[PDB]
Amino acid sequence: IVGGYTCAANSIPYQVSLNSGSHFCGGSLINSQWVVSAAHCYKSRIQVRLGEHNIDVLEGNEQFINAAKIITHPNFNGNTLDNDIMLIKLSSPATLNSRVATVSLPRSCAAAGTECLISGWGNTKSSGSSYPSLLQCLKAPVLSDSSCKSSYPGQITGNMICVGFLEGGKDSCQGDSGGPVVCNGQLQGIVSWGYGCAQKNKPGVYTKVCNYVNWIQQTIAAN
Amino acid sequence: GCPRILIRCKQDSDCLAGCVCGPNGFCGSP
Ligand SMILES: [Ca+2]
């Protein structure tokens, strides 16, 4: 997260870290047994870390659960990153508490201008690399489809939304993928891709999760 | 664009499509 702020500890209790030795992607807890992330974050083995704040220090309040199942959207396409959504089944259920909590799926698609909260442990520089120990947070609005399409001509499917600032300076970044964009208590976006980070006229592009509510509920109720 | 996954790299082929291996050994946009 470039241009954001350090989140208060456990202030984003649906945020998880996906770990394959080290942190590499985010995700969101949607029920006690399942995390939603981006499909390009697939790895054959994934450890889900819940209740995290400092991913580099054991606070004694975290939960460490390996993935038992990892299911990428069947139509995921690594080249246009359409259908960039993934479900991870925890090998044992998460214990829900004030620091480990679910986030609601969307009741409905999110309108342009809706203010959102994006979070993650990704790069905090738009040039160079500075990876935080502590979870970062950014408030940012949903952008209209036309402005999103205008920013990335011929690249934004109907399964993608832009959230951010066309003037630059504030965006998600590498290491934030799979992480949540939550607006009015609803997970509306999944960090997916962008041209660099926090560049002018190149906002973040996010999976439009409201298109996936049927796939999500149903994939869970089969695996 | 470049997907926003964190990948430690030695050279560009370690990276997803649209990314290159950055000067600090992380994948990112050219
Ligand atoms: Ca920790």
Angle formed at CA A42 by CA A36 and CA A44, multiple of 5 degrees: 115
A154 CB contacts (<8 Å, ≥6 apart)?
none
Which one, of A82, A47, A48, A41, lies nearest residue A177 by Cα? A41
Q: For this experimental structure, what is the resolution in angstroms?
A: 1.5
* Elucidation method: X-ray
Q: Say if residues A186 and A204 touch (Cβ distance below 8 Å).
A: no
Strand runs labelled E in chain A: 5-6, 15-19, 23-31, 34-37, 47-50, 63-72, 86-90, 115-120, 136-141, 160-163, 180-183, 186-194, 204-208
Helix, coil or strand: residue B14: helix
Judged by CB atoms closer than 8 Å, whether chains meet at A193 and B22 is answered as: no
d(CA A179, CA A40): 12
Give helix then strand counts, H and E, for chain A: 2, 13
- CATH number of the domain that residue B6 is part of: 4.10.75.20
Q: Say if residues A53 and A120 touch (Cβ distance below 8 Å).
A: no
Looking up tokens 């083995």, which residue turns up? Answer: A45
Looking up tokens 């990892």, which residue turns up? Answer: A70
Q: Say if residues A149 and A157 touch (Cβ distance below 8 Å).
A: no
Of these residues, A23, A82, A84, A171, which one is catalytic?
A84
One-letter amino acid for residue A174 of the chain: Q
Judged by CB atoms closer than 8 Å, whether chains meet at B3 and A204 is answered as: no
Which run of H or E residues covers position A214?
Answer: helix A213-220
Which one, of A99, A2, A84, lies nearest residue A36 by Cα? A84
d(CA A222, CA A197): 37
Which one, of A191, A34, A206, A4, lies nearest residue A110 by Cα? A206
Taking the alpha carbons at both ends of chain A, their separation in whole angstroms is 33
Ligand 1 centroid, distance to A221 Cα (angstroms): 31
Q: Say if residues A170 and A3 touch (Cβ distance below 8 Å).
A: yes
Q: What is the CA radius of gyration of chain B?
A: 7
Does A62 count as an annotated binding residue?
A: yes
d(CA A26, CA A117): 14
Provide the domain limits for residue B3.
Answer: 1-30
Instruction: Domains for chain A: give ranges and CATH numbers.
Output: 1-12+103-210 (2.40.10.10), 13-102+211-223 (2.40.10.10)
Domain tally, chain B: 1
